[PDB]
Design an enzyme around this catalytic site. Sequence first.
Site, short mmCIF file in Angstrom:
data_model
loop_
_atom_site.label_atom_id
_atom_site.label_comp_id
_atom_site.label_asym_id
_atom_site.label_seq_id
_atom_site.Cartn_x
_atom_site.Cartn_y
_atom_site.Cartn_z
N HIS A 136 8.48 -43.63 20.43
CA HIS A 136 9.66 -43.58 21.52
C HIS A 136 10.81 -44.46 21.24
CE1 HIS A 136 6.98 -40.60 23.22
NE2 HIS A 136 6.06 -41.54 23.63
N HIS B 15 7.25 -35.02 27.25
CA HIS B 15 6.60 -33.66 27.00
C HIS B 15 7.33 -32.57 27.87
CE1 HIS B 15 2.56 -36.12 26.75
NE2 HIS B 15 3.38 -36.51 25.78
N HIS C 77 1.14 -33.56 18.07
CA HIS C 77 1.57 -34.10 19.03
C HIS C 77 2.77 -35.01 18.88
CE1 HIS C 77 1.81 -35.06 23.30
NE2 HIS C 77 1.96 -36.26 22.90
N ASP D 171 6.56 -34.69 20.80
CA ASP D 171 7.26 -35.95 21.24
C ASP D 171 8.39 -36.38 20.71
OD1 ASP D 171 4.88 -37.08 23.08
OD2 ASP D 171 4.23 -38.52 21.64
#
Length: 300
Positions: free
Chosen positions: A265, A79, A238, A242
């Site tokens: 991720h 973030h 969001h 990311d």
Amino acid sequence: SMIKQRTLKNIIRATGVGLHSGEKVYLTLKPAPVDTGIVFCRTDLDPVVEIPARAENVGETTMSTTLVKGDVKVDTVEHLLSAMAGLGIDNAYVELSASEVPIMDGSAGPFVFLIQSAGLQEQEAAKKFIRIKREVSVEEGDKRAVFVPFDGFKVSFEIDFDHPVFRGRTQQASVDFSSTSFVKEVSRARTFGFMRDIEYLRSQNLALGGSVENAIVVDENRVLNEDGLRYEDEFVKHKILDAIGDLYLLGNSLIGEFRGFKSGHALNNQLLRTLIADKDAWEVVTFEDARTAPISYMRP
Ligand SMILES: C[C@@](CCn1ccc(-c2ccc(-n3nccn3)cc2)cc1=O)(C(=O)NO)S(C)(=O)=O
Ligand SMILES: C[C@@](CCn1ccc(-c2ccc(-n3nccn3)cc2)cc1=O)(C(=O)NO)S(C)(=O)=O
Ligand SMILES: [Cl-]
Ligand SMILES: [Zn+2]
Ligand SMILES: [Zn+2]
């Protein structure tokens, strides 16, 4: 003039807690010289451990993006890196007093505001961009992440949650930064998790700091946050936030387009490693005249 590298104009300080560790942490952002990149520093250690925010230093990718060096880690960098990417910061030292970046309100908003309050400083060196020249795609299972050549910067994402709060909602979004503001339309999108999972997460030392104060907490059939959502598509926005932060582990702003389908991720980092290795697929470019470039930045 040329598009110049940027660092911070003043030191920034913030305090918070790690989302996953729950530990109180002091964060200090400092100016750094040209060509430093973003470097995290564990200042609770002596000598400090410095970890450049680069794909080669990504260790763990479960529930956050984690940088590792030696025995040491910096958890949950995504973030903050999203805020630094969105504002065009090339060079900075990020000091932390503990092993996890503070979660703040769960979004990039507080970091963006702290940085923009301090101001940015242009430096006497050309800003380097990574331009995607050929498509690069990685898949695992039903997940996919792709870079495609694009004259600008654009990020698209699709999620698919088998959950009553998500079914029938906007689970795809695309942001082209020639026409959409990172600050206004992406940076405020908060992280999210599930009430059903909290006892289990905490049994694994995850989400120990998590609450409605720093995440959208989704129960079985409703959002628990009494004040509601900031965007109707906050969840997928969001995921875009990311992705921007994870992509900034390339170390330079991108000229290209990212498309994610249920990526997280781990797959984001696999895409970066594959891109870096496929050197025919990218090049480093600079702009002698900001007016003619495909990306433009706000005044510092
Ligand atoms: C002018 C305008 C938009 C300005 N802009 C420009 C660039 C980026 C940006 C963000 C992230 C990356 N990046 N992440 C990883 C790698 N590279 C690269 C670029 C964001 C943004 O916002 C605005 O007003 N912003 O407030 S606009 C008229 O399009 O709304
Ligand atoms: C990986 C990811 C999500 C990270 N995350 C964020 C919040 C929570 C969470 C869960 C439950 C509660 N809670 N239950 C009761 C009270 N409070 C609070 C917080 C868990 C989590 O894992 C992310 O944003 N990484 O950057 S994500 C969106 O990509 O899945
Ligand atoms: Cl993933
Ligand atoms: Zn996140
Ligand atoms: Zn190739």
